Design a protein around this ligand. Structure first.
Ligand SMILES: NC(=O)C1=CN([C@@H]2O[C@H](COP(=O)(O)OP(=O)(O)OC[C@H]3O[C@@H](n4cnc5c(N)ncnc54)[C@H](OP(=O)(O)O)[C@@H]3O)[C@@H](O)[C@H]2O)C=CC1
Lengths: 301, 301
Protein backbone atom coordinates (compact mmCIF):
# COMPACT_ATOMS: atom_id res chain seq x y z
CA UNK A 1 0.00 0.00 0.00
CA UNK A 2 2.92 2.30 -0.71
CA UNK A 3 1.62 5.90 -0.69
CA UNK A 4 1.41 8.35 -3.62
CA UNK A 5 0.94 12.07 -2.88
CA UNK A 6 -0.43 14.10 -5.78
CA UNK A 7 0.29 17.40 -3.99
CA UNK A 8 1.92 18.98 -0.93
CA UNK A 9 1.11 17.39 2.43
CA UNK A 10 1.87 19.66 5.39
CA UNK A 11 4.01 18.46 8.33
CA UNK A 12 1.57 16.48 10.50
CA UNK A 13 -0.25 15.60 7.29
CA UNK A 14 3.02 13.94 6.27
CA UNK A 15 4.59 12.98 9.61
CA UNK A 16 1.37 11.02 10.22
CA UNK A 17 1.46 9.32 6.85
CA UNK A 18 4.91 7.94 7.58
CA UNK A 19 3.76 6.03 10.65
CA UNK A 20 2.36 4.17 7.67
CA UNK A 21 3.28 3.86 3.93
CA UNK A 22 5.94 4.69 1.32
CA UNK A 23 5.49 8.24 -0.09
CA UNK A 24 5.93 8.53 -3.88
CA UNK A 25 5.89 11.69 -5.99
CA UNK A 26 8.64 10.66 -8.38
CA UNK A 27 9.68 7.77 -10.60
CA UNK A 28 7.45 4.80 -11.40
CA UNK A 29 4.80 3.82 -8.88
CA UNK A 30 3.72 0.21 -9.45
CA UNK A 31 2.82 -1.27 -6.04
CA UNK A 32 1.14 1.79 -4.55
CA UNK A 33 -2.64 1.36 -4.23
CA UNK A 34 -2.49 4.58 -2.18
CA UNK A 35 -4.63 7.65 -2.83
CA UNK A 36 -4.65 11.11 -1.19
CA UNK A 37 -5.19 13.44 -4.14
CA UNK A 38 -7.18 16.56 -5.13
CA UNK A 39 -7.63 15.80 -8.82
CA UNK A 40 -6.52 12.93 -11.06
CA UNK A 41 -5.65 12.62 -14.74
CA UNK A 42 -6.50 9.40 -16.60
CA UNK A 43 -2.75 9.47 -17.16
CA UNK A 44 -1.63 9.27 -13.51
CA UNK A 45 -4.01 6.32 -13.29
CA UNK A 46 -2.63 4.07 -16.03
CA UNK A 47 0.79 4.90 -14.57
CA UNK A 48 -0.05 3.28 -11.23
CA UNK A 49 -0.27 -0.51 -11.73
CA UNK A 50 -3.09 -2.01 -9.65
CA UNK A 51 -4.48 0.66 -7.32
CA UNK A 52 -6.50 -0.29 -4.24
CA UNK A 53 -8.75 2.76 -3.81
CA UNK A 54 -8.60 6.55 -4.18
CA UNK A 55 -8.93 9.30 -1.56
CA UNK A 56 -9.80 12.79 -2.78
CA UNK A 57 -9.16 15.57 -0.26
CA UNK A 58 -12.02 17.53 -1.79
CA UNK A 59 -15.61 16.79 -0.88
CA UNK A 60 -16.99 16.42 -4.39
CA UNK A 61 -16.32 13.77 -7.03
CA UNK A 62 -17.89 15.12 -10.24
CA UNK A 63 -14.50 16.23 -11.55
CA UNK A 64 -12.68 12.87 -11.36
CA UNK A 65 -12.14 11.19 -14.83
CA UNK A 66 -14.62 8.30 -14.34
CA UNK A 67 -14.42 6.61 -17.74
CA UNK A 68 -10.71 6.08 -17.00
CA UNK A 69 -11.69 4.12 -13.89
CA UNK A 70 -11.71 0.49 -12.53
CA UNK A 71 -15.31 -0.46 -11.54
CA UNK A 72 -13.75 -1.93 -8.39
CA UNK A 73 -11.11 0.37 -6.83
CA UNK A 74 -13.84 2.57 -5.23
CA UNK A 75 -13.42 6.18 -4.04
CA UNK A 76 -13.23 7.53 -0.45
CA UNK A 77 -13.57 11.32 -0.36
CA UNK A 78 -14.09 13.97 2.29
CA UNK A 79 -17.28 15.78 3.33
CA UNK A 80 -18.04 17.42 6.62
CA UNK A 81 -14.33 18.03 6.65
CA UNK A 82 -15.28 21.62 5.88
CA UNK A 83 -18.97 21.45 6.79
CA UNK A 84 -18.74 24.12 9.47
CA UNK A 85 -16.69 26.60 7.44
CA UNK A 86 -18.85 26.34 4.34
CA UNK A 87 -21.89 26.41 6.60
CA UNK A 88 -21.22 29.80 8.11
CA UNK A 89 -20.17 31.09 4.69
CA UNK A 90 -23.58 30.25 3.23
CA UNK A 91 -25.32 32.05 6.07
CA UNK A 92 -23.24 35.15 5.40
CA UNK A 93 -23.86 34.72 1.71
CA UNK A 94 -27.57 34.73 2.54
CA UNK A 95 -27.90 37.42 5.17
CA UNK A 96 -25.65 39.96 3.42
CA UNK A 97 -28.08 40.48 0.55
CA UNK A 98 -31.15 39.24 2.43
CA UNK A 99 -31.07 41.72 5.29
CA UNK A 100 -30.08 44.23 2.60
CA UNK A 101 -26.74 44.96 4.29
CA UNK A 102 -24.78 45.21 1.05
CA UNK A 103 -27.46 47.34 -0.62
CA UNK A 104 -27.88 49.86 2.19
CA UNK A 105 -24.14 50.05 2.74
CA UNK A 106 -23.89 51.21 -0.85
CA UNK A 107 -26.64 53.79 -0.47
CA UNK A 108 -24.90 55.15 2.62
CA UNK A 109 -21.62 55.48 0.78
CA UNK A 110 -23.27 57.39 -2.07
CA UNK A 111 -24.92 59.81 0.32
CA UNK A 112 -28.38 58.28 0.00
CA UNK A 113 -29.79 58.08 3.53
CA UNK A 114 -33.33 57.09 2.69
CA UNK A 115 -35.02 54.07 4.24
CA UNK A 116 -36.99 53.25 1.12
CA UNK A 117 -36.04 49.56 1.05
CA UNK A 118 -37.85 47.26 3.44
CA UNK A 119 -35.75 44.78 5.42
CA UNK A 120 -37.10 41.22 5.04
CA UNK A 121 -37.37 39.02 8.13
CA UNK A 122 -36.13 35.49 8.35
CA UNK A 123 -38.53 34.59 11.15
CA UNK A 124 -41.63 32.88 9.80
CA UNK A 125 -40.20 32.80 6.31
CA UNK A 126 -40.24 29.93 3.85
CA UNK A 127 -36.65 28.96 3.19
CA UNK A 128 -35.51 26.05 1.04
CA UNK A 129 -32.34 24.07 1.62
CA UNK A 130 -31.47 21.84 -1.33
CA UNK A 131 -29.19 19.05 -0.19
CA UNK A 132 -29.27 17.80 3.37
CA UNK A 133 -26.66 16.64 5.83
CA UNK A 134 -23.23 18.06 6.70
CA UNK A 135 -23.57 21.49 5.13
CA UNK A 136 -27.24 21.48 4.23
CA UNK A 137 -28.11 20.32 7.72
CA UNK A 138 -26.03 22.86 9.64
CA UNK A 139 -27.56 25.61 7.54
CA UNK A 140 -31.04 24.19 7.99
CA UNK A 141 -30.52 23.99 11.76
CA UNK A 142 -29.52 27.64 12.01
CA UNK A 143 -32.22 28.99 9.73
CA UNK A 144 -34.81 27.10 11.76
CA UNK A 145 -33.25 28.37 14.97
CA UNK A 146 -33.79 31.84 13.53
CA UNK A 147 -37.48 31.16 13.11
CA UNK A 148 -37.53 30.16 9.46
CA UNK A 149 -40.02 27.72 7.98
CA UNK A 150 -37.18 25.64 6.55
CA UNK A 151 -38.17 23.20 3.83
CA UNK A 152 -35.29 20.72 3.53
CA UNK A 153 -34.84 18.84 0.25
CA UNK A 154 -32.78 15.69 -0.34
CA UNK A 155 -32.65 12.29 -2.04
CA UNK A 156 -32.86 9.97 0.97
CA UNK A 157 -35.43 11.34 3.48
CA UNK A 158 -34.70 11.35 7.22
CA UNK A 159 -34.02 14.77 8.75
CA UNK A 160 -34.77 17.18 11.60
CA UNK A 161 -35.87 20.89 12.03
CA UNK A 162 -37.78 21.08 8.72
CA UNK A 163 -40.50 19.83 6.38
CA UNK A 164 -38.41 17.38 4.28
CA UNK A 165 -39.33 16.91 0.57
CA UNK A 166 -38.28 14.78 -2.41
CA UNK A 167 -39.14 17.52 -4.91
CA UNK A 168 -36.74 20.43 -5.37
CA UNK A 169 -39.78 22.25 -6.76
CA UNK A 170 -41.85 21.93 -3.62
CA UNK A 171 -39.32 23.71 -1.39
CA UNK A 172 -38.76 26.60 -3.74
CA UNK A 173 -42.53 27.25 -4.03
CA UNK A 174 -43.06 30.84 -2.90
CA UNK A 175 -39.83 30.42 -0.96
CA UNK A 176 -38.18 33.69 -0.01
CA UNK A 177 -34.72 32.09 -0.07
CA UNK A 178 -32.78 28.93 -0.73
CA UNK A 179 -29.33 27.77 0.29
CA UNK A 180 -28.17 25.17 -2.21
CA UNK A 181 -25.49 22.68 -1.25
CA UNK A 182 -26.20 19.68 -3.46
CA UNK A 183 -23.27 17.50 -4.59
CA UNK A 184 -22.90 17.25 -8.37
CA UNK A 185 -23.66 13.86 -9.89
CA UNK A 186 -25.68 12.70 -12.90
CA UNK A 187 -28.89 13.24 -10.95
CA UNK A 188 -28.03 16.76 -9.82
CA UNK A 189 -26.78 18.21 -13.14
CA UNK A 190 -29.10 20.95 -14.47
CA UNK A 191 -31.56 19.93 -11.75
CA UNK A 192 -32.76 23.38 -10.72
CA UNK A 193 -34.12 25.16 -13.78
CA UNK A 194 -35.64 28.52 -14.68
CA UNK A 195 -39.14 27.15 -14.18
CA UNK A 196 -38.19 25.95 -10.70
CA UNK A 197 -36.41 29.15 -9.70
CA UNK A 198 -39.42 31.08 -10.98
CA UNK A 199 -41.55 29.37 -8.32
CA UNK A 200 -39.73 31.45 -5.71
CA UNK A 201 -40.81 34.91 -4.63
CA UNK A 202 -39.89 37.62 -7.16
CA UNK A 203 -38.08 39.05 -4.15
CA UNK A 204 -36.13 35.88 -3.30
CA UNK A 205 -32.46 35.33 -2.63
CA UNK A 206 -30.95 32.10 -3.94
CA UNK A 207 -27.65 31.06 -2.38
CA UNK A 208 -25.49 28.46 -4.11
CA UNK A 209 -22.55 27.04 -2.23
CA UNK A 210 -22.13 23.62 -3.80
CA UNK A 211 -21.30 22.87 -7.43
CA UNK A 212 -22.73 25.42 -9.87
CA UNK A 213 -23.55 22.90 -12.63
CA UNK A 214 -26.47 21.83 -10.40
CA UNK A 215 -28.25 24.89 -11.75
CA UNK A 216 -28.91 25.45 -15.42
CA UNK A 217 -26.66 28.44 -16.09
CA UNK A 218 -29.05 29.83 -18.71
CA UNK A 219 -31.97 29.69 -16.31
CA UNK A 220 -30.20 31.66 -13.62
CA UNK A 221 -29.16 34.32 -16.07
CA UNK A 222 -32.69 34.58 -17.42
CA UNK A 223 -34.49 34.94 -14.11
CA UNK A 224 -31.85 37.41 -12.97
CA UNK A 225 -32.59 39.55 -16.00
CA UNK A 226 -36.34 39.34 -15.33
CA UNK A 227 -36.54 39.80 -11.56
CA UNK A 228 -34.46 42.82 -10.41
CA UNK A 229 -35.24 41.99 -6.80
CA UNK A 230 -34.23 38.36 -7.30
CA UNK A 231 -30.72 37.82 -6.04
CA UNK A 232 -28.21 35.14 -6.87
CA UNK A 233 -25.37 34.87 -4.33
CA UNK A 234 -22.84 32.20 -5.17
CA UNK A 235 -19.38 31.07 -4.11
CA UNK A 236 -19.27 28.50 -6.93
CA UNK A 237 -19.40 28.96 -10.68
CA UNK A 238 -19.87 27.24 -14.01
CA UNK A 239 -16.49 28.62 -14.99
CA UNK A 240 -15.13 26.40 -12.21
CA UNK A 241 -11.96 28.34 -11.32
CA UNK A 242 -11.89 30.38 -14.55
CA UNK A 243 -14.47 32.92 -13.36
CA UNK A 244 -13.77 35.26 -16.26
CA UNK A 245 -16.22 32.97 -18.07
CA UNK A 246 -19.05 33.98 -15.75
CA UNK A 247 -18.22 37.67 -15.69
CA UNK A 248 -21.58 38.42 -17.30
CA UNK A 249 -23.09 37.49 -13.95
CA UNK A 250 -20.80 39.66 -11.85
CA UNK A 251 -21.90 42.75 -13.77
CA UNK A 252 -25.52 42.16 -12.83
CA UNK A 253 -26.59 44.35 -9.90
CA UNK A 254 -28.58 41.50 -8.41
CA UNK A 255 -25.66 39.09 -8.09
CA UNK A 256 -23.29 38.54 -5.14
CA UNK A 257 -20.22 36.57 -6.06
CA UNK A 258 -17.30 35.04 -4.18
CA UNK A 259 -14.27 33.15 -5.68
CA UNK A 260 -15.06 29.66 -4.37
CA UNK A 261 -13.63 30.49 -0.94
CA UNK A 262 -16.25 29.08 1.42
CA UNK A 263 -13.62 27.20 3.39
CA UNK A 264 -10.98 25.06 1.74
CA UNK A 265 -9.41 27.37 -0.83
CA UNK A 266 -10.40 30.26 1.44
CA UNK A 267 -8.96 29.24 4.81
CA UNK A 268 -5.61 27.57 5.49
CA UNK A 269 -6.73 26.06 8.79
CA UNK A 270 -9.75 24.50 7.08
CA UNK A 271 -7.46 23.09 4.38
CA UNK A 272 -5.10 21.47 6.86
CA UNK A 273 -8.10 20.02 8.69
CA UNK A 274 -9.57 18.57 5.51
CA UNK A 275 -6.14 16.99 4.96
CA UNK A 276 -5.57 15.67 8.50
CA UNK A 277 -9.10 14.36 8.01
CA UNK A 278 -8.02 12.52 4.87
CA UNK A 279 -5.07 11.24 6.87
CA UNK A 280 -7.19 9.55 9.56
CA UNK A 281 -9.31 8.09 6.75
CA UNK A 282 -6.46 6.68 4.65
CA UNK A 283 -5.15 5.03 7.79
CA UNK A 284 -8.26 2.88 8.19
CA UNK A 285 -8.31 1.85 4.50
CA UNK A 286 -5.66 -0.56 5.73
CA UNK A 287 -6.54 -1.30 9.36
CA UNK A 288 -9.68 -2.89 7.92
CA UNK A 289 -11.91 -0.10 9.18
CA UNK A 290 -14.89 1.50 7.45
CA UNK A 291 -14.31 3.43 4.17
CA UNK A 292 -16.34 6.60 4.75
CA UNK A 293 -17.97 8.46 1.83
CA UNK A 294 -17.45 5.54 -0.62
CA UNK A 295 -18.88 6.75 -3.94
CA UNK A 296 -21.14 4.93 -6.43
CA UNK A 297 -20.12 5.01 -10.09
CA UNK A 298 -23.69 4.80 -11.44
CA UNK A 299 -24.68 8.13 -9.82
CA UNK A 300 -22.25 9.52 -12.38
CA UNK A 301 -22.20 6.37 -14.53
CA UNK B 1 -59.11 57.13 31.49
CA UNK B 2 -57.96 59.48 28.74
CA UNK B 3 -55.01 58.33 26.65
CA UNK B 4 -52.96 60.83 24.64
CA UNK B 5 -51.56 59.57 21.36
CA UNK B 6 -49.27 61.57 19.16
CA UNK B 7 -48.63 59.28 16.21
CA UNK B 8 -50.48 57.35 13.47
CA UNK B 9 -52.07 54.24 14.97
CA UNK B 10 -52.59 50.95 13.15
CA UNK B 11 -56.37 50.19 12.94
CA UNK B 12 -55.66 47.00 14.84
CA UNK B 13 -54.34 49.08 17.77
CA UNK B 14 -57.08 51.75 17.80
CA UNK B 15 -59.71 49.06 17.90
CA UNK B 16 -58.18 47.58 21.05
CA UNK B 17 -57.39 50.90 22.75
CA UNK B 18 -60.95 52.13 22.31
CA UNK B 19 -62.19 49.25 24.47
CA UNK B 20 -60.06 50.62 27.32
CA UNK B 21 -59.48 54.34 26.87
CA UNK B 22 -60.78 57.60 25.52
CA UNK B 23 -58.11 58.34 22.93
CA UNK B 24 -57.26 62.03 22.82
CA UNK B 25 -55.03 63.59 20.18
CA UNK B 26 -55.45 67.27 20.96
CA UNK B 27 -57.39 69.95 22.75
CA UNK B 28 -57.36 70.06 26.54
CA UNK B 29 -55.07 67.35 27.89
CA UNK B 30 -55.74 68.17 31.54
CA UNK B 31 -57.50 64.90 32.35
CA UNK B 32 -55.14 62.75 30.35
CA UNK B 33 -53.67 60.10 32.70
CA UNK B 34 -52.63 58.60 29.35
CA UNK B 35 -49.30 57.81 27.72
CA UNK B 36 -48.60 56.02 24.36
CA UNK B 37 -45.97 57.82 22.31
CA UNK B 38 -42.69 57.41 20.44
CA UNK B 39 -41.30 60.81 21.33
CA UNK B 40 -42.65 63.51 23.61
CA UNK B 41 -41.71 67.13 24.11
CA UNK B 42 -41.68 69.23 27.24
CA UNK B 43 -44.41 71.28 25.57
CA UNK B 44 -46.69 68.24 25.64
CA UNK B 45 -45.61 67.23 29.13
CA UNK B 46 -46.64 70.59 30.55
CA UNK B 47 -50.19 70.14 29.32
CA UNK B 48 -50.58 66.81 31.13
CA UNK B 49 -50.74 67.58 34.90
CA UNK B 50 -52.43 64.28 35.70
CA UNK B 51 -50.29 62.12 33.45
CA UNK B 52 -49.36 59.10 35.55
CA UNK B 53 -48.09 56.59 32.98
CA UNK B 54 -46.18 56.81 29.70
CA UNK B 55 -45.91 53.81 27.39
CA UNK B 56 -43.20 54.24 24.79
CA UNK B 57 -43.31 52.29 21.53
CA UNK B 58 -39.54 52.15 20.98
CA UNK B 59 -37.20 49.81 22.84
CA UNK B 60 -35.02 52.62 24.18
CA UNK B 61 -35.82 55.63 26.37
CA UNK B 62 -32.76 57.87 26.19
CA UNK B 63 -34.54 60.14 23.71
CA UNK B 64 -37.16 61.10 26.32
CA UNK B 65 -36.92 64.57 27.94
CA UNK B 66 -36.67 62.96 31.37
CA UNK B 67 -35.72 66.30 32.89
CA UNK B 68 -39.25 67.40 32.04
CA UNK B 69 -41.10 64.26 33.14
CA UNK B 70 -42.41 64.63 36.70
CA UNK B 71 -40.53 62.08 38.92
CA UNK B 72 -43.71 60.09 39.61
CA UNK B 73 -44.88 59.48 36.06
CA UNK B 74 -43.78 55.85 35.55
CA UNK B 75 -42.34 55.25 32.10
CA UNK B 76 -42.47 51.81 30.52
CA UNK B 77 -40.84 51.12 27.22
CA UNK B 78 -40.96 48.31 24.72
CA UNK B 79 -37.99 45.90 24.34
CA UNK B 80 -38.03 42.47 22.80
CA UNK B 81 -40.85 43.85 20.72
CA UNK B 82 -38.28 43.90 17.93
CA UNK B 83 -35.69 41.60 19.50
CA UNK B 84 -35.81 39.02 16.74
CA UNK B 85 -35.71 41.50 13.86
CA UNK B 86 -32.79 43.46 15.29
CA UNK B 87 -31.17 40.15 16.24
CA UNK B 88 -30.98 38.77 12.68
CA UNK B 89 -29.90 42.18 11.47
CA UNK B 90 -26.88 42.17 13.79
CA UNK B 91 -25.83 38.76 12.57
CA UNK B 92 -26.04 39.97 8.98
CA UNK B 93 -24.14 43.07 9.97
CA UNK B 94 -21.50 40.79 11.41
CA UNK B 95 -21.20 38.03 8.83
CA UNK B 96 -21.23 40.31 5.76
CA UNK B 97 -17.88 41.91 6.62
CA UNK B 98 -16.67 39.03 8.81
CA UNK B 99 -16.88 36.25 6.25
CA UNK B 100 -15.54 38.87 3.82
CA UNK B 101 -18.65 38.63 1.61
CA UNK B 102 -18.83 42.37 0.90
CA UNK B 103 -15.12 42.65 0.19
CA UNK B 104 -14.85 39.65 -2.14
CA UNK B 105 -18.04 40.69 -3.92
CA UNK B 106 -16.29 43.96 -4.73
CA UNK B 107 -13.16 42.24 -5.97
CA UNK B 108 -15.26 40.01 -8.22
CA UNK B 109 -17.06 43.02 -9.67
CA UNK B 110 -13.80 44.78 -10.51
CA UNK B 111 -12.38 41.70 -12.22
CA UNK B 112 -10.06 40.71 -9.40
CA UNK B 113 -10.45 36.93 -8.98
CA UNK B 114 -7.62 36.35 -6.54
CA UNK B 115 -8.11 34.51 -3.27
CA UNK B 116 -5.60 36.64 -1.39
CA UNK B 117 -7.89 37.38 1.56
CA UNK B 118 -8.31 34.66 4.16
CA UNK B 119 -11.83 33.97 5.38
CA UNK B 120 -12.14 34.07 9.19
CA UNK B 121 -13.99 31.32 10.95
CA UNK B 122 -16.55 31.92 13.65
CA UNK B 123 -16.07 28.47 15.15
CA UNK B 124 -13.70 28.61 18.12
CA UNK B 125 -13.52 32.38 17.95
CA UNK B 126 -13.56 34.90 20.79
CA UNK B 127 -16.71 36.98 20.30
CA UNK B 128 -17.96 39.66 22.69
CA UNK B 129 -21.63 40.60 23.12
CA UNK B 130 -22.03 43.83 25.08
CA UNK B 131 -25.51 43.97 26.56
CA UNK B 132 -27.41 40.80 27.36
CA UNK B 133 -31.03 39.76 27.13
CA UNK B 134 -33.57 40.24 24.33
CA UNK B 135 -31.27 41.20 21.49
CA UNK B 136 -27.92 40.54 23.14
CA UNK B 137 -29.09 37.11 24.19
CA UNK B 138 -30.50 36.02 20.84
CA UNK B 139 -27.28 37.06 19.19
CA UNK B 140 -25.20 35.34 21.85
CA UNK B 141 -27.15 32.12 21.51
CA UNK B 142 -26.66 32.02 17.72
CA UNK B 143 -22.97 32.84 17.82
CA UNK B 144 -22.47 30.12 20.42
CA UNK B 145 -24.50 27.71 18.32
CA UNK B 146 -22.05 28.51 15.51
CA UNK B 147 -19.16 27.45 17.69
CA UNK B 148 -18.04 30.82 18.97
CA UNK B 149 -16.40 31.39 22.33
CA UNK B 150 -19.02 33.99 23.20
CA UNK B 151 -18.13 36.31 26.06
CA UNK B 152 -21.36 37.96 27.18
CA UNK B 153 -21.15 41.28 29.01
CA UNK B 154 -23.89 42.92 31.09
CA UNK B 155 -24.76 44.84 34.27
CA UNK B 156 -26.71 42.20 36.18
CA UNK B 157 -25.10 38.74 35.72
CA UNK B 158 -27.19 35.64 35.10
CA UNK B 159 -26.98 34.23 31.58
CA UNK B 160 -26.51 31.16 29.36
CA UNK B 161 -24.25 29.96 26.43
CA UNK B 162 -21.28 32.16 27.36
CA UNK B 163 -18.65 33.30 29.84
CA UNK B 164 -20.52 36.28 31.43
CA UNK B 165 -18.43 39.33 32.55
CA UNK B 166 -18.98 42.65 34.33
CA UNK B 167 -16.15 44.38 32.49
CA UNK B 168 -16.69 45.47 28.88
CA UNK B 169 -12.89 45.33 28.62
CA UNK B 170 -12.62 41.67 29.50
CA UNK B 171 -14.84 40.55 26.61
CA UNK B 172 -13.14 42.65 23.99
CA UNK B 173 -9.68 41.33 24.94
CA UNK B 174 -8.24 39.74 21.82
CA UNK B 175 -11.83 39.31 20.68
CA UNK B 176 -12.22 38.89 16.92
CA UNK B 177 -15.70 40.40 16.99
CA UNK B 178 -18.27 42.16 19.10
CA UNK B 179 -22.00 42.68 18.71
CA UNK B 180 -22.99 45.69 20.79
CA UNK B 181 -26.62 46.12 21.86
CA UNK B 182 -26.39 48.12 25.07
CA UNK B 183 -29.19 50.51 26.01
CA UNK B 184 -28.10 54.14 26.34
CA UNK B 185 -28.24 55.50 29.90
CA UNK B 186 -25.83 57.52 32.07
CA UNK B 187 -23.79 54.38 32.73
CA UNK B 188 -23.43 53.41 29.07
CA UNK B 189 -22.59 56.83 27.58
CA UNK B 190 -19.02 56.80 26.15
CA UNK B 191 -18.53 53.42 27.84
CA UNK B 192 -16.55 51.71 25.08
CA UNK B 193 -13.44 53.77 24.37
CA UNK B 194 -10.47 53.67 22.00
CA UNK B 195 -8.38 51.93 24.64
CA UNK B 196 -11.03 49.22 25.02
CA UNK B 197 -11.61 48.80 21.29
CA UNK B 198 -7.83 48.55 20.87
CA UNK B 199 -7.88 45.42 23.05
CA UNK B 200 -9.55 43.59 20.18
CA UNK B 201 -7.70 41.88 17.36
CA UNK B 202 -6.32 44.34 14.79
CA UNK B 203 -8.41 42.26 12.42
CA UNK B 204 -11.65 42.53 14.44
CA UNK B 205 -15.19 43.37 13.37
CA UNK B 206 -17.15 45.54 15.81
CA UNK B 207 -20.91 45.52 15.25
CA UNK B 208 -23.07 48.22 16.90
CA UNK B 209 -26.81 47.79 16.77
CA UNK B 210 -27.89 49.70 19.87
CA UNK B 211 -27.47 53.41 20.52
CA UNK B 212 -24.23 54.87 19.07
CA UNK B 213 -23.50 57.25 21.99
CA UNK B 214 -22.41 54.14 23.91
CA UNK B 215 -19.19 54.34 21.93
CA UNK B 216 -16.90 57.35 22.13
CA UNK B 217 -17.24 58.63 18.58
CA UNK B 218 -13.66 59.92 18.51
CA UNK B 219 -12.31 56.57 19.62
CA UNK B 220 -14.02 54.63 16.83
CA UNK B 221 -12.78 57.09 14.25
CA UNK B 222 -9.27 56.83 15.60
CA UNK B 223 -8.95 53.08 15.66
CA UNK B 224 -10.56 52.88 12.24
CA UNK B 225 -7.86 55.19 10.91
CA UNK B 226 -5.17 53.03 12.52
CA UNK B 227 -6.32 49.50 11.83
CA UNK B 228 -7.33 49.08 8.17
CA UNK B 229 -8.42 45.49 8.87
CA UNK B 230 -10.54 46.70 11.79
CA UNK B 231 -14.15 47.07 10.73
CA UNK B 232 -16.98 49.05 12.20
CA UNK B 233 -20.42 47.90 11.04
CA UNK B 234 -23.26 49.91 12.52
CA UNK B 235 -26.95 50.51 12.00
CA UNK B 236 -26.96 53.32 14.54
CA UNK B 237 -25.15 56.63 14.57
CA UNK B 238 -24.15 59.62 16.67
CA UNK B 239 -25.90 61.77 14.11
CA UNK B 240 -29.07 60.03 15.29
CA UNK B 241 -31.19 60.29 12.15
CA UNK B 242 -29.15 63.08 10.56
CA UNK B 243 -26.43 60.73 9.22
CA UNK B 244 -24.89 63.46 7.09
CA UNK B 245 -23.08 64.32 10.32
CA UNK B 246 -21.35 60.93 10.38
CA UNK B 247 -20.47 60.95 6.69
CA UNK B 248 -16.79 60.92 7.53
CA UNK B 249 -17.32 57.35 8.68
CA UNK B 250 -19.10 56.21 5.55
CA UNK B 251 -16.14 57.23 3.38
CA UNK B 252 -13.81 54.96 5.34
CA UNK B 253 -13.39 51.69 3.48
CA UNK B 254 -13.45 49.72 6.71
CA UNK B 255 -16.92 50.83 7.74
CA UNK B 256 -20.26 49.22 6.93
CA UNK B 257 -23.24 51.42 7.59
CA UNK B 258 -27.01 51.10 7.50
CA UNK B 259 -29.60 53.84 8.21
CA UNK B 260 -30.98 52.62 11.51
CA UNK B 261 -33.18 49.99 9.85
CA UNK B 262 -32.58 46.93 12.00
CA UNK B 263 -36.30 46.37 12.43
CA UNK B 264 -38.67 49.13 13.46
CA UNK B 265 -38.00 51.89 10.95
CA UNK B 266 -36.89 49.17 8.53
CA UNK B 267 -39.87 46.82 8.48
CA UNK B 268 -43.57 47.69 8.58
CA UNK B 269 -44.57 44.35 10.12
CA UNK B 270 -42.05 44.82 12.92
CA UNK B 271 -43.41 48.34 13.56
CA UNK B 272 -47.01 47.16 13.79
CA UNK B 273 -45.94 44.42 16.16
CA UNK B 274 -44.03 46.85 18.39
CA UNK B 275 -47.21 48.90 18.55
CA UNK B 276 -49.42 45.94 19.36
CA UNK B 277 -47.08 44.89 22.13
CA UNK B 278 -47.02 48.44 23.47
CA UNK B 279 -50.80 48.47 23.41
CA UNK B 280 -50.84 45.19 25.28
CA UNK B 281 -48.58 46.46 28.03
CA UNK B 282 -50.59 49.62 28.40
CA UNK B 283 -53.78 47.62 28.81
CA UNK B 284 -52.36 45.46 31.59
CA UNK B 285 -51.43 48.71 33.25
CA UNK B 286 -54.98 49.92 32.66
CA UNK B 287 -56.51 46.75 34.08
CA UNK B 288 -54.37 46.98 37.21
CA UNK B 289 -51.59 44.53 36.39
CA UNK B 290 -47.82 45.00 36.40
CA UNK B 291 -46.67 46.54 33.09
CA UNK B 292 -43.39 45.25 31.68
CA UNK B 293 -40.29 47.36 31.08
CA UNK B 294 -40.86 49.93 33.79
CA UNK B 295 -37.97 52.38 33.49
CA UNK B 296 -35.69 53.02 36.44
CA UNK B 297 -35.47 56.84 36.31
CA UNK B 298 -32.00 57.22 37.83
CA UNK B 299 -30.56 55.21 34.93
CA UNK B 300 -31.21 58.39 32.96
CA UNK B 301 -31.29 60.77 35.94
N1 LIG C 1 -30.53 50.15 16.23
C1 LIG C 1 -31.77 49.59 16.28
O1 LIG C 1 -32.42 49.24 15.31
C2 LIG C 1 -32.42 49.38 17.70
C3 LIG C 1 -31.59 49.57 18.84
N2 LIG C 1 -32.21 49.37 20.12
C4 LIG C 1 -31.29 49.58 21.34
O2 LIG C 1 -31.24 48.39 22.16
C5 LIG C 1 -31.75 48.65 23.49
C6 LIG C 1 -32.67 47.49 23.92
O3 LIG C 1 -31.83 46.32 23.98
P1 LIG C 1 -32.55 44.85 24.30
O4 LIG C 1 -31.68 43.75 23.83
O5 LIG C 1 -33.87 44.85 23.58
O6 LIG C 1 -32.74 44.81 25.93
P2 LIG C 1 -33.43 45.49 27.16
O7 LIG C 1 -34.31 45.81 26.02
O8 LIG C 1 -33.54 46.93 27.56
O9 LIG C 1 -31.81 45.69 27.43
C7 LIG C 1 -31.44 45.24 28.79
C8 LIG C 1 -30.08 44.45 28.76
O10 LIG C 1 -28.88 45.32 28.66
C9 LIG C 1 -28.44 45.52 30.02
N3 LIG C 1 -28.15 46.85 30.44
C10 LIG C 1 -28.95 47.96 30.53
N4 LIG C 1 -28.27 49.03 30.95
C11 LIG C 1 -26.99 48.56 31.11
C12 LIG C 1 -25.78 49.21 31.55
N5 LIG C 1 -25.79 50.51 31.89
N6 LIG C 1 -24.63 48.43 31.62
C13 LIG C 1 -24.70 47.09 31.27
N7 LIG C 1 -25.77 46.42 30.87
C14 LIG C 1 -26.89 47.24 30.79
C15 LIG C 1 -29.33 44.81 30.95
O11 LIG C 1 -28.80 44.66 32.21
P3 LIG C 1 -29.93 44.83 33.47
O12 LIG C 1 -30.90 43.77 33.25
O13 LIG C 1 -28.93 44.63 34.59
O14 LIG C 1 -30.43 46.21 33.28
C16 LIG C 1 -29.78 43.64 30.08
O15 LIG C 1 -28.82 42.64 29.82
C17 LIG C 1 -32.54 49.96 23.41
O16 LIG C 1 -32.52 50.59 24.68
C18 LIG C 1 -31.79 50.71 22.28
O17 LIG C 1 -30.74 51.55 22.80
C19 LIG C 1 -33.56 48.99 20.24
C20 LIG C 1 -34.29 48.82 19.10
C21 LIG C 1 -33.81 48.99 17.75
Amino acid sequence: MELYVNFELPPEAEEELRKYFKIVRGGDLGNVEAALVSRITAEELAKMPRLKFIQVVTAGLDHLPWESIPPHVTVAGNAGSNADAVAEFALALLLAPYKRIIQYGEKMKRGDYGRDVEIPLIQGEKVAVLGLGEIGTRVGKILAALGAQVRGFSRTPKEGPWRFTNSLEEALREARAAVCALPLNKHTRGLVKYQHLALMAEDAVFVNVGRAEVLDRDGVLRILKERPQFIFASDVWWGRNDFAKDAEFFSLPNVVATPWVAGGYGNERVWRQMVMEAVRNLITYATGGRPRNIAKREDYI
